[PDB]
Amino acid sequence: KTSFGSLKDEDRIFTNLYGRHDWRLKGALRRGDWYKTKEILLKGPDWILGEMKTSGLRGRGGAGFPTGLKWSFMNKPSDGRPKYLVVNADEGEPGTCKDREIMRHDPHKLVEGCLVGGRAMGARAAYIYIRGEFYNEASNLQVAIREAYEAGLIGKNACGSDYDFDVFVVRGAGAYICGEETALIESIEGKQGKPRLKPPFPADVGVFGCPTTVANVETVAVSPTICRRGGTWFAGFGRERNSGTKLFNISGHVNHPCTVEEEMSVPLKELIEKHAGGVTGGWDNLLAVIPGGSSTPLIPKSVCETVLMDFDALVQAQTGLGTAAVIVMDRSTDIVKAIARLIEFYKHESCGQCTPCREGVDWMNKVMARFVKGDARPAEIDSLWEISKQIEGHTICALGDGAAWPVQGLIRHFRPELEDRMQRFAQQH
Amino acid sequence: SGVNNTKKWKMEFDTRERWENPLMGWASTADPLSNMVLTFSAKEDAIAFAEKNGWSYDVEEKKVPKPKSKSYGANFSWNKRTRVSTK
Amino acid sequence: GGALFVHRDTPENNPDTPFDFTPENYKRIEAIVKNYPEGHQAAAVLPVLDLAQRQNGWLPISAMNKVAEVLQVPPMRVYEVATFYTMYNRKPVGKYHIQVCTTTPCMLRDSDSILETLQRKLGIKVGETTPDKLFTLIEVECLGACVNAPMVQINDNYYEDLTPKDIEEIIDELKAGKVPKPGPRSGRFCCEPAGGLTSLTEPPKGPGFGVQAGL
Ligand SMILES: Cc1cc2nc3c(=O)[nH]c(=O)nc-3n(C[C@H](O)[C@H](O)[C@H](O)COP(=O)(O)O)c2cc1C
Ligand code: SF4
Ligand code: FES
């Protein structure tokens, strides 16, 4: 009802998050994994979707979409085409390592979630597109998959259910745009990581031109624990429309950076000081914070105090949760420089098939380098705003929104810094 | 790809000789109607004008493109050849 | 620039350049192709190409052409992939390719110090190789190690939460024929806090715990 801060280990869902117990099948069974999955499967798929819905579980990929409805767009009769499930593990969003931690320290949960979601959707296999820089993680994942095939939990008779299911892993060759539902699919299919438009929707025609449902590592890894303990239990955590135990990644200008699970709608200040050791110099030295990943607008110290780290509160704070990768900056930062490096990152990682991002992101990178130097005039800030707004809702994917938003945040809270840089540059001439 | 000059009917005359001028090398004509072009809203209007003025005419019907089925999903198919390799 | 996206033939990189897969690589390729439906085998391009890269270290044009020939694909559909993805090396690289992350989650935590210390120890620039053809330094984006920052990636291994002294150690070791231990160079083993476990220091409950009845 209130004070959604603390969370006991009895309720933590990623138990081996710090590599303290064996990540193989022995620790998985000893910790509560691959238990009763047979009954989970012999239960109908509609029941699994009912659980996903009554849990309030919203995807963690960066957009707040409810799974149950997402995974229910796919609970249709088959038209003689194999249905699939594609797991998104290409966490290239700056500040995000939760999926790495999962992959490498508790992969049997991910595998069990693949199987559960597959029975929910009617799938035939699970394609786990994983980043290519994560070679050791993918190897651990394949080891786990081999253990599972040997134990009989996936394959011909998955746990003794009459349901046959495979799990494939796929490396990505290092691209951030391949993290989108659609460019992911194109990569798998062999083509460039160039997203496709919607419609069509992956559920109708997706990977290999077949029905498809893309989902984040955390979502699927949670699904079996929900179906096993209960969605209402998952929904007692957090606020009404946003609920669950969410992984957090606290990076930058913080003394004890870490990854953590907590109750959503938690106060950000607590989330920092209690788990981390607080910002290096003290809350007073906090210049600004990025609540989610690089694709989320900044918010300054002023509102960072009374802000709840969930979707809706961050929206009302003119920002968003995203992947919940709290990047912290103190007063010793050229914040303009950090945002300009973010824009350079988005410039490199753009695919280049739709004009707005392709051109305007490099445009904004040049303008931002100029602002760093201060060679610009303060009449160009509104030009940059207009450029951002021309990019925002006119793209095929969100990477344009992600490149436009941090600029909007910078200009919405740190315009005087830019104007002062311009004034100093004019004096220096 | 503009289709705004494919709306109004035109009237054009037969082409006649054009010979270089020896002095400069320009194109000369003894054809006053070499550049006569009239614009009509329909075919019967042009036919009437031609008949009236005493000219002989050969008409050419209007070419409208045929409506075409188009789908962005066809580019992504499981079994058909519409499957494209160039995204 | 350095990433030109064009290919002008040379003696080192021409179609006649001597590439070919090993009898083991061919069976790995057969398996890969088997991981996809029977009509869709042009989806193995990325794994087969990275495999060739592993065998040869880098990717010449003959490599892409042979990948195509094997998968029966147009070679341009492979040139596009190679140019698009950055993990694919189309110029020969050093024994130990060093990819330094310089995005803000790492930059904030003094990553340019590491970039410089590597510029000096090695005697190269931000995108060059060494005369010994052993080291190759480049700047790259977030590698999913934002909490254990700074960090660098050296030939499929990470080295995290490090400092000039630590990177100097790593380089002195790679120049002696050793392969160091991937992971944070500080006390912590992974993303766990440095002070101490603040989230899960209890023991885990184990099987059948929290299970709802009627399942
Ligand atoms: C440029 C870009 C990058 C993305 N990267 C990721 C990513 O790394 N991981 C992820 O889970 N979702 C990512 N997404 C979001 C995708 O839509 C994702 O496949 C989907 O939201 C996952 O479903 P879920 O959020 O319901 O779990 C990205 C989106 C865009 C536009
Ligand atoms: S916004 Fe950028 S990354 Fe997204 S589809 Fe357009 S060009 Fe590609
Ligand atoms: S910003 Fe360097 S690993 Fe993420």
Side-chain angles (χ1 to χ4, degrees):
Chain A
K1 333 302 203 64
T2 183
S3 58
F4 301 97
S6 193
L7 192 69
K8 301 164 288 313
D9 303 0
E10 60 157 48
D11 289 329
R12 294 287 175 71
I13 185 157
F14 296 95
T15 65
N16 188 47
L17 171 59
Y18 302 111
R20 299 310 211 188
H21 300 285
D22 70 82
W23 54 270
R24 280 151 173 175
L25 177 72
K26 296 289 170 286
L29 306 168
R30 189 173 298 122
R31 285 174 314 219
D33 315 279
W34 292 115
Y35 164 92
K36 207 160 268 273
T37 309
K38 186 186 200 294
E39 293 74 353
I40 307 285
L41 271 300
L42 275 296
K43 281 284 206 325
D46 295 29
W47 179 89
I48 299 177
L49 311 182
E51 284 287 347
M52 291 307 109
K53 272 181 284 214
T54 195
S55 56
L57 174 77
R58 272 174 87 178
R60 321 303 200 195
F65 262 91
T67 73
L69 292 69
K70 198 191 197 176
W71 299 8
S72 305
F73 296 171
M74 198 173 185
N75 189 29
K76 278 266 290 167
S78 199
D79 54 358
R81 289 196 298 166
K83 295 195 275 188
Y84 283 104
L85 183 154
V86 184
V87 187
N88 196 318
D90 189 348
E91 50 161 21
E93 203 164 310
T96 298
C97 317
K98 60 189 206 173
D99 298 330
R100 195 207 179 189
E101 305 312 326
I102 300 164
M103 290 169 225
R104 71 171 158 168
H105 291 148
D106 207 315
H108 282 266
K109 284 166 71 66
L110 195 157
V111 176
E112 189 178 25
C114 296
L115 178 66
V116 172
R119 170 61 270 149
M121 306 169 200
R124 188 211 206 87
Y127 280 102
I128 296 169
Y129 183 97
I130 174 161
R131 192 165 174 171
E133 290 76 333
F134 296 171
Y135 190 86
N136 301 323
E137 298 77 358
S139 304
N140 292 13
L141 195 47
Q142 294 293 64
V143 170
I145 291 159
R146 183 178 63 81
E147 292 184 329
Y149 274 111
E150 292 268 13
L153 313 159
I154 62 191
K156 185 57 179 74
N157 280 93
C159 304
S161 305
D162 193 28
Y163 180 71
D164 55 357
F165 194 83
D166 284 321
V167 180
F168 306 115
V169 176
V170 178
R171 293 165 43 71
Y176 168 64
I177 182 55
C178 291
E180 191 201 327
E181 302 176 337
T182 49
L184 196 78
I185 291 167
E186 295 272 281
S187 179
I188 293 172
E189 293 163 4
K191 301 178 279 171
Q192 288 70 242
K194 283 168 144 63
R196 64 171 67 89
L197 287 75
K198 298 187 234 184
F201 288 97
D204 312 318
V205 58
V207 69
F208 309 125
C210 286
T212 310
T213 284
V214 178
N216 184 6
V217 164
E218 176 167 331
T219 317
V220 298
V222 166
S223 55
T225 307
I226 286 175
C227 295
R228 161 181 311 141
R229 298 178 77 176
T232 178
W233 160 87
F234 209 70
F237 294 135
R239 263 157 56 172
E240 165 58 28
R241 275 95 52 72
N242 51 4
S243 63
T245 287
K246 178 63 187 82
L247 274 151
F248 290 99
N249 306 331
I250 301 146
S251 190
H253 286 348
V254 64
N255 59 7
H256 295 288
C258 54
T259 52
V260 175
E261 314 158 48
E262 323 179 354
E263 261 174 29
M264 297 191 59
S265 301
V266 55
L268 163 65
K269 183 176 168 50
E270 294 178 7
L271 179 157
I272 299 188
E273 300 283 320
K274 171 170 184 295
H275 291 103
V279 60
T280 65
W283 191 257
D284 295 337
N285 187 20
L286 187 76
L287 189 154
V289 160
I290 314 186
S294 89
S295 56
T296 59
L298 285 159
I299 45 171
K301 166 170 206 318
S302 315
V303 305
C304 281
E305 319 174 6
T306 60
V307 68
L308 289 81
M309 180 57 47
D310 64 357
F311 299 101
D312 309 323
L314 287 169
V315 179
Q316 267 63 66
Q318 289 151 328
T319 184
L321 180 62
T323 54
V326 180
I327 303 151
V328 173
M329 284 78 76
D330 61 12
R331 294 188 176 157
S332 68
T333 51
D334 292 340
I335 192 163
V336 181
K337 183 165 168 159
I339 305 297
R341 190 55 174 91
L342 262 62
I343 300 295
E344 184 189 351
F345 155 86
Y346 281 108
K347 196 268 186 198
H348 285 133
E349 297 290 325
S350 161
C351 82
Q353 70 179 357
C354 86
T355 301
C357 162
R358 187 174 67 227
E359 314 299 353
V361 175
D362 190 7
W363 191 347
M364 287 216 294
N365 190 46
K366 296 176 177 175
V367 179
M368 268 288 165
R370 223 159 64 208
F371 287 3
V372 167
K373 297 291 98 177
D375 189 79
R377 329 156 301 186
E380 302 182 6
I381 298 178
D382 301 87
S383 163
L384 188 44
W385 189 273
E386 281 192 324
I387 290 173
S388 301
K389 301 294 268 218
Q390 284 171 181
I391 298 176
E392 202 176 19
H394 308 70
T395 46
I396 294 171
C397 86
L399 186 161
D401 299 289
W405 282 336
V407 160
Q408 294 186 16
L410 190 59
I411 292 157
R412 186 185 304 126
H413 298 308
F414 298 104
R415 189 204 273 263
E417 180 52 44
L418 309 162
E419 299 172 324
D420 185 73
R421 278 184 200 251
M422 294 156 177
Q423 199 253 311
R424 302 194 331 260
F425 194 91
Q427 287 186 285
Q428 290 277 113
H429 52 255
Chain B
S1 64
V3 74
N4 194 69
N5 298 335
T6 71
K7 303 207 177 319
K8 293 310 197 303
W9 288 74
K10 295 263 165 288
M11 184 194 266
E12 200 188 355
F13 285 76
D14 58 357
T15 43
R16 302 288 194 73
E17 197 188 4
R18 273 158 215 185
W19 67 95
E20 304 190 333
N21 204 44
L23 197 149
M24 296 305 293
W26 300 334
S28 298
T29 50
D31 179 4
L33 309 165
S34 47
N35 42 30
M36 166 53 59
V37 182
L38 300 158
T39 310
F40 305 89
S41 287
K43 187 173 75 205
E44 294 77 24
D45 290 314
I47 296 175
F49 204 70
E51 297 167 322
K52 187 168 69 165
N53 264 273
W55 294 318
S56 64
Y57 50 95
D58 212 8
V59 194
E60 307 291 308
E61 289 294 352
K62 188 190 153 56
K63 281 192 206 76
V64 59
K66 62 171 63 142
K68 295 170 189 84
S69 62
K70 299 210 78 78
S71 179
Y72 179 78
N75 309 342
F76 321 109
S77 178
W78 182 57
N79 47 19
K80 304 308 209 85
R81 299 151 161 168
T82 57
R83 183 43 172 283
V84 72
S85 55
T86 45
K87 187 68 216 72
Chain C
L4 295 164
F5 305 148
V6 289
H7 180 288
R8 300 183 314 158
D9 282 316
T10 63
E12 297 107 353
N13 202 343
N14 61 67
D16 306 329
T17 316
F19 181 81
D20 186 310
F21 278 105
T22 72
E24 294 67 20
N25 297 140
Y26 275 110
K27 301 201 284 295
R28 302 184 174 117
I29 287 165
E30 196 194 352
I32 289 165
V33 173
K34 214 173 196 218
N35 292 158
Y36 310 98
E38 305 288 7
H40 297 264
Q41 70 292 327
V45 170
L46 303 89
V48 175
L49 197 50
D50 205 298
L51 170 51
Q53 194 213 29
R54 276 171 208 285
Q55 190 254 313
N56 220 38
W58 70 295
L59 281 168
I61 193 70
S62 43
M64 316 193 210
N65 287 341
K66 191 66 177 309
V67 171
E69 181 174 352
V70 176
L71 278 298
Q72 308 216 334
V73 190
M76 188 64 205
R77 306 285 81 103
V78 184
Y79 306 162
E80 289 186 305
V81 158
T83 48
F84 186 90
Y85 300 97
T86 55
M87 294 282 292
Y88 292 144
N89 287 133
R90 297 179 284 112
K91 306 199 219 171
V93 288
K95 179 54 58 62
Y96 291 116
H97 197 186
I98 304 168
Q99 327 181 351
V100 190
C101 189
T102 318
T103 309
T104 67
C106 285
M107 202 183 62
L108 267 46
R109 312 269 289 196
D110 213 8
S111 196
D112 308 89
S113 44
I114 294 91
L115 185 41
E116 202 80 9
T117 55
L118 289 185
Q119 275 162 349
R120 306 174 177 271
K121 175 77 180 185
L122 279 52
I124 57 186
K125 295 285 180 49
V126 69
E128 299 179 340
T129 64
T130 44
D132 198 350
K133 303 292 193 295
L134 192 152
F135 290 120
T136 310
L137 186 75
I138 51 154
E139 209 179 338
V140 299
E141 311 285 6
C142 186
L143 303 166
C146 315
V147 289
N148 312 279
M151 53 77 58
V152 308
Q153 181 196 4
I154 314 175
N155 290 10
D156 82 2
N157 276 17
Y158 282 13
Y159 305 92
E160 304 164 45
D161 201 0
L162 58 85
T163 47
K165 199 77 196 161
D166 291 323
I167 199 71
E168 279 205 328
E169 298 163 4
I170 299 166
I171 298 288
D172 301 359
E173 295 150 0
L174 295 181
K175 276 150 87 151
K178 298 299 309 313
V179 65
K181 310 300 299 183
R185 284 282 156 292
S186 315
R188 84 205 302 202
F189 306 94
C190 80
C191 52
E192 64 185 2
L197 269 285
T198 184
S199 164
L200 59 97
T201 185
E202 280 187 358
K205 295 291 184 288
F209 178 89
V211 69
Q212 70 190 329
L215 175 281

